[PDB]
Amino acid sequence: ASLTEIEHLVQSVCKSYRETCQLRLEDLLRQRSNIFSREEVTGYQRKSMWEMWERCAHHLTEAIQYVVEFAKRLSGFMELCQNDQIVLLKAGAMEVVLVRMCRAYNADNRTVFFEGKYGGMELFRALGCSELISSIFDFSHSLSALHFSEDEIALYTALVLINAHRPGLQEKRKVEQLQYNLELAFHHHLCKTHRQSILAKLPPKGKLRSLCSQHVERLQIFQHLHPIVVQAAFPPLYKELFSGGGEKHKILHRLLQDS
Numbered sequence: 515a516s517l518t519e520i521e522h523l524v525q526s527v528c529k530s531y532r533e534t535c536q537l538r539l540e541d542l543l544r545q546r547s548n549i550f551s552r553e554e555v556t557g558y559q560r561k562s563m564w565e566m567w568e569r570c571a572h573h574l575t576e577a578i579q580y581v582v583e584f585a586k587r588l589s590g591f592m593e594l595c596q597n598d599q600i601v602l603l604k605a606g607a608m609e610v611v612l613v614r615m616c617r618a619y620n621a622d623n624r625t626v627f628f629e630g631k632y633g634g635m636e637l638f639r640a641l642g643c644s645e646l647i648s649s650i651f652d653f654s655h656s657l658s659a660l661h662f663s664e665d666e667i668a669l670y671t672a673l674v675l676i677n678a679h680r681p682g683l684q685e686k687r688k689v690e691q692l693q694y695n696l697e698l699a700f701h702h703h704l705c706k707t708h709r710q711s712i713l714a715k716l717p718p719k720g721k722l723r724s725l726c727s728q729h730v731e732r733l734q735i736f737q738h739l740h741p742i743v744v745q746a747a748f749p750p751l752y753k754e755l756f757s758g759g760g761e762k763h764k765i766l767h768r769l770l771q772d773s
């Protein structure tokens with residue numbers, strides 16, 4: 515590409531991200547005083563393990579559905595073959611969601627916007643995956659220290675998704691070229707905004723890989739404890755992405771096929 519084309523990619527990526535945000539940042543900030551009461555927190559903690567897992571899986575599936583739409587609107591993504599579209603989404607959808615989560619996290623009080631209000635990690639105690647929860651909260655806490663702009667989150671999550679190193683890509687070189695153009699767009703934007711200092715502060719990729727592995731692993735523990743709940747009450751797209759073998763369900767291909 516060249517300078518006009520790079521800036522066009524910058525604006526296109528930021529537009530795609532705005533149109534596929536579940537919640538506007540302003541909406542999330544305005545809600546910061548709306549925190550679960552101690553009695554509402556006690557009620558979450560008295561919910562059964564399987565109901566809290568189902569509710570979190572539903573919450574996560576809705577966020578993932580927006581990431582799929584982001585991908586479809588991302589320059590060049592729909593040009594890739596369907597095998598590679600699916601490889602990239604299966605690998606990076608949750609990674610994007612974990613990054614997007616910092617917008618909904620309040621570092622002042624260590625709360626996250628969940629089911630209409632802000633609550634701390636104690637809200638999730640019924641899940642029985644305390645390590646994963648605090649790992650996710652610590653990750654959001656670290657990202658919040660970066661003070662991402664919406665444009666920065668747009669460009670960075672595009673790169674999280676368009677990763678040419680994902681195992682299973684049939685057209686690796688084509689993904690390499692798309693990745694390179696998006697890197698140019700991200701780094702051009704950082705250069706023009708004097709934000710290149712954030713490059714050193716971005717999490718290593720192995721950290722997002724690790725969080726995703728923990729989630730799958732805790733799911734396997736839960737699935738062993740309540741296999742019928744997973745089969746009957748977990749969202750089909752969630753099972754396709756995370757549960758073994760859940761990927762007999764193909765939701766993604768329909769989400770990609772339908773306009």
Ligand code: NA
Pocket residue numbers: 616617618619620621658
């Ligand atoms: Na934040």
